């Protein structure tokens, strides 16, 4: 079942087999992925999250990001660990106490200390439209058209060698899939469907690293919502889902009763289908439990390319046609050097005081915040561009916004922008040597906001920044229960800081 708007949610660790090798994890709701959290556009979310972590080799402290959820007003429930909030300690519990208006779509909650998502603490989070303009294009939404795909490692995320190449165990498709190498054959996942109905898929990826090339052997995907944000239909055959990313698509019911395939490749470790690694079964009622027989095609007829994708809303971009034409136009220089990476000549490093609570406590220029060099300011009421030029070792690279979605003005592998209807959403690949990635949001959200890669990996060697949006009005924007306040004296005082 779905748990939510208010619910308890309790951080633990256990052992899990997901691919037949036994492991200690970080668990939400005692699952992986954890158990989705749900509710209708514009509810009060009230999640306690119950820190119950023994194990240090994970980390006993935590704290929960709810993925593209704009937090206005409630910069403090946001999650980042040292920018919106200390972590919660262990033995101890924290009320998530947000609204979610002018929201609805696909989303999904992980923990935003370190690596310590890799571990396990990912699940989704599905804010439904009683109103949806697309409610009529499908006949079935709720649970069990959640698809999540992540990756998952043997090693422990703190154990990771400094020095060594990080590549993942086995992909996991609704939390079960095949390990790449010792390959045993374990459960994997059915998603199951009646011939003749019509399912609102909700993709979700909750990688660490590795985008995937989705694909349902026999089906095509009609694409609807990217993001959170609707689109106009898409029918593609495949698709290209970086870290953090969402699409709800309608999958037809129209092929023979049987089994098919459902391939998620990943751009690292394993590569095909030997033993059922990357593999999960689509299996219409009726059918004979067995295998898929299927094969995918040499080539995808009709691959996801983002230019294609166009909001179903008059959304339009913001600014002026042109580079630059914005009230605050900014050109990142992102960059990866031995064993780091940096935005600005500047790798990020969290502060011990989180950034929130560096400004409440009254800095309020940028230059004044720690870490120095890491915190940009953004004026109110503004329309800024970031253009985000790729060449970094290690892409393609996710970059994510919080508190924000944002126009895609330029997409990868293209040159030319789009300022009359891109896609609008809130993780984008930047892309390969020479693209410029470029994004397009105004500011109507005043707070401390992160912008990262996705690559968990890369964000724990520093590719990020704060983007510290209206600085004078976060004060009084965001006021702050006293449990906030209580955590970083809490955290503090338990690590002897
Ligand atoms: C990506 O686009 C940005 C603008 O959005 C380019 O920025 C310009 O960079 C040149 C130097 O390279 C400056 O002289 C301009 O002041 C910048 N802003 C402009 C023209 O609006 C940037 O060069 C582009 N990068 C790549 C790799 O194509
Ligand atoms: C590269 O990106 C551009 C800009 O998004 C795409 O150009 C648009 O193409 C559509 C479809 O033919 C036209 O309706 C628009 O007028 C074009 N806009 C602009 C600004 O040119 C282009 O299709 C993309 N290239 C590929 C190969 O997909
Ligand atoms: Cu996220
Ligand atoms: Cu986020
Ligand atoms: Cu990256
Ligand atoms: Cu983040």
């Not at 989704?124 to 697309?134: A, E, G, I, L």
């Not at 095909?272 to 094969?295: K, Q």
């Amino acid at each position: 079942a779905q748990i939510g708007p208010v619910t308890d949610l309790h951080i633990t660790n256990a052992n899990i087999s997901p691919d037949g090798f036994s492991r200690p994890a970080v668990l939400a709701g005692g699952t992986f992925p954890g158990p989705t959290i749900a509710g209708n556009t514009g509810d009060n979310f009230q999640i306690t999250v119950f820190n119950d972590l023994t194990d240090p080799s994970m980390l006993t402290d935590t704290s929960i990001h709810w993925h593209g959820l704009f937090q206005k007003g409630t910069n403090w429930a946001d999650g980042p660990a040292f920018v919106t909030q200390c972590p919660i300690i262990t033995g101890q519990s924290f009320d998530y106490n947000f609204n979610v208006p002018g929201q609805a779509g696909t989303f999904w909650y992980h923990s935003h200390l370190s690596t310590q998502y890799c571990d396990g603490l990912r699940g989704p989070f599905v804010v439904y439209d009683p109103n949806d303009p697309n409610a009529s294009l499908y006949d079935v939404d709720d649970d069990t058209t959640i698809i999540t795909l992540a990756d998952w490692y043997h090693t422990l995320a703190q154990q990771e060698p400094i020095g060594a190449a990080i590549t993942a165990d086995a992909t996991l498709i609704n939390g079960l899939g095949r390990s790449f190498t010792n390959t045993t054959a374990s459960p994997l996942s059915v998603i199951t469907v009646q011939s003749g109905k019509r399912y609102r898929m909700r993709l979700v990826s909750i990688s660490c690293d590795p985008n995937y090339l989705f694909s349902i052997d026999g089906h095509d995907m009609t694409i609807i919502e990217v993001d959170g944000v609707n689109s106009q239909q898409l029918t593609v055959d495949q698709i290209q889902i970086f870290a953090a990313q969402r699409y709800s698509f309608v999958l037809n019911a129209n092929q023979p009763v049987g089994n098919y395939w459902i391939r998620a490749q990943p751009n690292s470790g394993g590569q095909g289908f030997d033993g059922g690694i990357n593999s999960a079964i689509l299996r219409y009622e009726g059918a004979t439990v067995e295998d898929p027989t299927t094969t995918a095609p040499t080539t995808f007829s009709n691959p996801l390319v983002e230019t294609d994708l166009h909001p179903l809303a008059d959304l339009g971009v913001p600014g002026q046609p042109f580079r630059g034409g914005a009230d605050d136009p900014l050109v990142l220089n992102l960059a990866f050097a031995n064993g780091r990476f940096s935005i600005d000549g500047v790798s990020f490093v969290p502060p011990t005081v989180p950034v929130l609570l560096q400004i409440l406590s009254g800095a309020q220029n940028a230059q004044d915040l720690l870490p120095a060099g890491s915190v940009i300011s953004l004026p109110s009421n503004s329309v800024i561009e970031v253009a985000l030029p790729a060449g970094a070792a290690g892409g393609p690279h996710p970059f994510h916004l919080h508190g924000h979605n944002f126009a895609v003005v330029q997409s990868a592998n293209n040159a030319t922008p789009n300022y009359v209807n891109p896609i609008w959403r809130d993780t984008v690949s930047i892309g390969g040597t020479g693209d410029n990635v470029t994004i397009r949001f105004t500011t109507n959200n005043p707070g401390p906001w992160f912008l990262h890669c996705h690559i968990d990996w890369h964000l724990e060697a520093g590719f990020a920044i704060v983007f510290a949006e209206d600085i004078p009005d976060t004060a009084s924007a965001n006021p702050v229960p006293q449990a906030w306040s209580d955590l970083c004296p809490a955290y503090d005082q338990a690590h002897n800081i």
